[PDB]
Write a protein that binds this ligand. Structure first.
Ligand SMILES: CC[C@@]1(O)C[C@H](O)c2c(cc3c(c2O)C(=O)c2c(O)cccc2C3=O)[C@H]1C(=O)OC
Ligand SMILES: CC[C@@]1(O)C[C@H](O)c2c(cc3c(c2O)C(=O)c2c(O)cccc2C3=O)[C@H]1C(=O)OC
Lengths: 339, 341
């Protein structure tokens, strides 16, 4: 009972079985004809006796079901492992792609709790970003995973802010540019600038080009720690401050405050857990612990945000309620920061 | 969507690694010894306090810890199983510095085990499983410790599932510490027993039986069970031995046992024998089977697979004795009685 619950919680074979099914494109090969284990083994280049033992666990956890003897089809949850599903969960669990490869850092979590520093380098030889720049195949798969989420996740944050009295918007860490794209559709009178670093600056140009927004959202390069090149009535920090330590985040916040036009606002799009609420913490701590072992960053509660804001001459005006997006598991918040 | 959260939870590595880190840090033991605040726990575990609190946050979410009083954390009923003195020994079984949990890192390369059917332990640690233990005394001793705790209780029910009245001598191939032989001696004082075991791991046998007060009537012989067995016996026992080996090697050990079988004797296999369609619990069975694959290239075998191996060794499965329930042991076992065909 309690012995069963503890063993299930500390089991490594179940999450590795799921990641193996995704890496082998198992669900894809089933939908495309391969019904028997003999055909599934041939298409995945695996030994049939071993694949059946993996399927046996996949059946026991509800990702596959036996429909007629020997024929295995995916369940409704197992259908998410199809490569063309909108949630892209197969790519997120592919051990050859960036995120699931990086999740191996969790096998050294005791070191991360001892030091507070990431363990990615201790497994792959280089830190997270240096390894991406040296493996273009991995940098591409990471850029892809970010773009699949950015194409839909910003309609709700865009709707949670009034843009009538806004002239220009600067998105620091503009990423692919999905947020700036969502602001353009919501408020066509606003001009947007995506400010990115030397690396991601060109993944933003190509994304807004393919959206038909090249003439509507400018993309400039820059460094977040130097003075900002332009002023804006609204500066956006969407999932950027969680990558930097505390002493570097107040600098980015200070530069934003400095470049903030009169009456403007700084918008922080991230999590802001409150100790009292009964909100789901599963996805939040997943992201938080990922930040620890990947880069050393961290999430921040609403109380810590007040400390960061006050240190940048800013004040947290208001946290706009839970932002829900169709295929985005983690609900987010919008923080409004005034001087 | 509920399916999106169900799939992400099943495929998550942060939850099981948080449990193993808590076990490795002896977190629950330090709480029960006075340290309830984070600053006290960080001092006793030699960790960074801000990082420790983030690990505690996941532990309370998954119900292993609870925040009774502000800033003070206490283990739940499930969390109390990570205390080191707990009879199930789950803290040692999740300790990343000890043999079993260290070997579970082999799961990170499970796709290679499905492509080749051979273990992945060597690709993580440089040497195969047993060769790595024989070379790291700290690890072999921790491995011996995990088995010995289980061998102290898991053999009363299997011993009671067999009639020893007409048995004169019992040979236990792969006799482990010697728990099965110790359970038979207490149940049938008229039985002499010999424990057979390979190099290095015979050392754990003589001291366990001595500490059981049975050093008199349980012999211990060092040998290799791919060679002719040291003697004949009315009952030859294979308690969780064959699952460590592939099919061709298991048939050879089975063939050596059939060669040393006295007239009228029986070979007893103590392991699992699931029947496809039984509908019995398969959480503990799949874990052990997949562990055997990545650890050593072994496997569990179904009732039908057992019929094939027995026939290849000149044997027939006469009886399969029902689910054996042993205290603090999550996996019910079985006793297959084999006779010459
Ligand atoms: C380097 C790592 C990185 O920071 C990359 C990038 O910064 C990013 C991450 C996380 C999230 C979002 C990001 O853009 C994001 O936009 C978002 C959102 O709109 C709505 C809900 C959750 C999220 C969310 O959890 C981080 C990550 O772990 O990616 C695998
Ligand atoms: C590496 C160690 C080894 O492969 C071989 C080792 O001998 C052994 C194992 C497993 C079991 C028993 C063992 O003795 C055992 O006695 C037993 C029992 O009496 C009653 C129920 C279950 C079990 C059981 O699952 C394997 C293992 O991986 O440990 C979990």
């Amino acid at each position: 009972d309690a012995l069963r619950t503890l063993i299930r919680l500390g089991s490594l074979h179940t999450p590795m079985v799921v990641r193996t099914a995704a890496t082998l494109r198992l669900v894809d090969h089933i939908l495309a004809g391969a019904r028997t284990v003999k055909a599934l083994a041939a298409r995945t280049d695996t030994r049939p006796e071993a694949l059946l033992r993996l399927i046996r666990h996949l059946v026991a956890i509800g990702l596959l079901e036996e429909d007629a003897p020997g024929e295995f089809v995916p369940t409704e949850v197992g259908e998410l492992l199809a490569d063309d599903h909108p949630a892209a969960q197969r790519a997120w669990h592919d051990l050859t792609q960036a995120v699931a490869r990086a999740d191996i850092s969790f096998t050294r979590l005791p070191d991360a709790i001892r030091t507070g520093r990431p363990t990615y380098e201790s497994i792959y030889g280089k830190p997270f970003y240096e390894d991406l720049a040296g493996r273009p195949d991995l940098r591409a798969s990471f850029d892809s995973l970010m773009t699949t989420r950015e194409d839909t996740a910003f309609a709700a944050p865009a709707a949670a802010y009034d843009w009538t009295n806004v002239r220009h918007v600067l998105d620091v860490g503009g990423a692919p540019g999905g947020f700036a794209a969502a602001i353009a559709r919501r408020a066509p009178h606003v001009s947007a600038t995506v400010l990115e670093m030397a690396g991601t600056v060109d993944t933003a140009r190509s994304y807004l080009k393919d959206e038909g927004l090249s003439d509507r959202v400018d993309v400039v390069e820059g460094d977040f720690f130097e003075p900002l090149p332009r002023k804006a009535d609204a500066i956006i920090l969407s999932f950027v401050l969680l990558n930097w330590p505390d002493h570097d985040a107040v600098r980015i916040l200070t530069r934003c405050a400095e470049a903030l036009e009169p009456g403007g606002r700084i918008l922080i799009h991230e999590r802001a857990d409150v100790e009292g609420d009964g909100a789901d913490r599963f996805f939040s701590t997943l992201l938080d612990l990922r930040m620890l072992v990947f880069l050393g960053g961290a999430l921040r509660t609403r109380e810590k945000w007040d400390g960061l804001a006050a240190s940048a001459g800013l004040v947290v005006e208001e946290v706009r309620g839970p932002l829900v997006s169709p295929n985005v598991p983690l609900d987010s918040c919008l923080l409004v920061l005034a001087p």
